[PDB]
């Protein structure tokens, strides 16, 4: 006779996110050739790692103006992708849709002052255990990097992702109050005649920024 099957009382509905390829209608249509086309990016975090975008600082600018005092602190921000300082970059705009990242966010600083004036800045990552640093002397201890301005102004830094969990959230849920990923800093450890000379900042992904569990959000 006919082949018997048992239609399961359950799991017959549309999951809305299930490898199912809907059945065929109006077939045998050969779309026009779209081969060898420029700017083709297979996946995201290949564009983010490669095309860095600016960060947002006070007054809606991408740069942090060098202050005239010899030792002062510049723009200090939480590390989580939802940080007002990254609210306008491609990296945060994309990591909005995903729930947890697992990678080193990469920062580019390039100096825009005249060749008249040199300046020497440092950036220091501070884990989430104790209050953030407030002076270069009290911040030299944590992971930091120092650099002088020169013919080449771009100085990258790879903000190390080190956390007690192999992944880490990208949306800081309202429950806690001091970000669990720790603060980064940017200090005027000394400058030359450059006062109000813009240091524009950039953000990017590192050699391993892996993103998983994509979710939705009203945005």
């Amino acid at each position, epitope marked *: 006779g006919i082949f018997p099957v048992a239609c399961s009382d359950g799991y017959g509905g549309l999951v809305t996110t299930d490898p199912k390829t809907a059945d065929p209608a109006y077939g045998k249509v050969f779309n026009p050739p779209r081969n060898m086309l420029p700017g083709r990016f297979t996946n995201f975090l290949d564009v983010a790692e490669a095309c860095p975008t600016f960060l947002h*600082f*006070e*007054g*809606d*600018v991408p*740069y*942090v*103006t*060098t*202050k*005239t*005092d*010899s*030792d*002062r*602190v510049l*723009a200090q921000f939480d590390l989580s992708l939802a940080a007002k300082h990254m609210s306008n970059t491609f990296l945060a705009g994309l990591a909005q849709y995903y729930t947890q990242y697992s990678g080193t966010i990469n920062l580019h600083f390039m100096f825009t002052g005249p060749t008249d004036a040199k300046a020497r800045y440092m950036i220091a990552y501070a884990p989430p255990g104790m209050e953030p640093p*407030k*002076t270069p002397e009290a911040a030299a201890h944590c992971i930091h990097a120092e650099w002088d301005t020169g013919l080449n102004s771009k100085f990258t830094f790879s903000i190390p992702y080190l956390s007690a969990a192999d992944y880490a959230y990208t949306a800081s849920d309202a429950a806690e109050t001091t970000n669990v990923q720790g603060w980064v800093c940017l200090f005027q450890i000394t400058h030359g005649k450059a*006062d*109000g*000379d*813009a240091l524009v900042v950039l953000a990017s992904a590192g050699k391993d920024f892996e993103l998983r569990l994509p979710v939705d959000a009203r945005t």
Partner: antibody
Amino acid sequence: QVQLRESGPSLVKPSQTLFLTCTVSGFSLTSYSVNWVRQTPGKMLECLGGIATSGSTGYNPVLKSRLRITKDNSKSQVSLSVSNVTPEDTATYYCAKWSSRGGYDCGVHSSDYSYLDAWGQGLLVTVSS
Amino acid sequence: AVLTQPSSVSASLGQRVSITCSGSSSNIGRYGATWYQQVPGSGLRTIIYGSSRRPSGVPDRFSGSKSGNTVTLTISSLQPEDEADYFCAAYDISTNAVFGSGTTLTLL
């Protein structure tokens, strides 16, 4: 000559936004930054913040999240904003100029080689319920 | 106001007046404080910047120096035009300046 004229509202009801301005006159705002410092009735000074020649600026950390400073680089006037005023925000409000391109934060209040040489006459902001 | 100031001091003309401004390790010493002046009814002027210097336009009789965690304003000669409130202000490690109470200096 350089002078700073400040125009703003007085007598306003608490819990309301405050729109202060410091018409700058005598020099280009691009060459000298302006800082805002207030003086409560009697004798005190609580630095509010300032705006550098460049867009980047800074504010008082204890008074941040209720301060926003814009800059009309052509009209040459700089503006303040206070999100929600309380009966204690009443003070004498000044605008001041640093001698260097960037003096946006409260760091300009104490500096080794930079000062605030030009001060506006100051407006008295009164709020009460 | 979050610094130590010596109330209001007085003296007569052509007398030396020294007003000390005592802070804390974080607020003063790391960076020299500044000294203002406010005539009753008029706005703030800057008298010492960098804790030890003068702004051009201010006469030479104002002299400040910084020691340890306290600074001091020394008026080498007093005049009738130097009667006003004197505030000391200094940048604190908290990123917010801490201001003195004002040393009203009255001439006799």
